[PDB]
């Protein structure tokens, strides 16, 4: 579970989500995935957490 | 990832957490694991949703 671009709100509690675009499917730890178009679809994890995963690097 | 017991608060936004206890580890999506040598490991992560049950 990694995220190159985790964006959080400036507030309490912290609300963060991963904006990474993955091709064709979201990573393993994602519960809600939104993919635009089909094969190579553009998939985004909608999951909101109170924190961020370390970068994919 | 999975969770058999997920307690979320009734707020907006929702605040959820897994209370599951494992002997020496947390599930795979867990950022923050607290283990107590009592055996009791549990994930402290707070999120807006719940993983599907492990069972």
The experimental technique used to determine this model is X-ray
A3 interaction partners in chain B (CB closer than 8 Å): none
**Pair B44, B17: CB distance under 8 Å:** yes
**Residues of the domain holding A29:** 1-57
Structural domains in chain B (count): 1
Nearest CA in chain A to B51: A31
For β-strands B40-43 and A42-45, DSSP reports them as unpaired
Q: What is the CATH number of the domain that holds B37?
A: 2.10.69.10
User: Which residue's entry shows tokens 């058999």?
Assistant: B4
**Pair A29, B28: CB distance under 8 Å:** yes
User: Which residue's entry shows tokens 């939104």?
Assistant: A34
Distances (CA, A) of A53 to A7, A39, B37: 11, 26, 27
Distances (CA, A) of B14 to A42, B28, B34, B35: 27, 22, 22, 25
The C-alpha atoms of residue A5 and residue A2 are separated, in whole angstroms, by 9
């Amino acid at each position: 579970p990694c995220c190159d671009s985790c964006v959080c709100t400036k507030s309490i509690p912290p609300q963060c989500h991963c904006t990474n675009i993955r091709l064709n499917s979201c990573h393993s730890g994602c519960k809600s995935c939104l993919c635009t178009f089909s094969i190579p679809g553009s998939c985004r994890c909608l999951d909101i957490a109170n924190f961020c995963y370390k970068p994919c690097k």
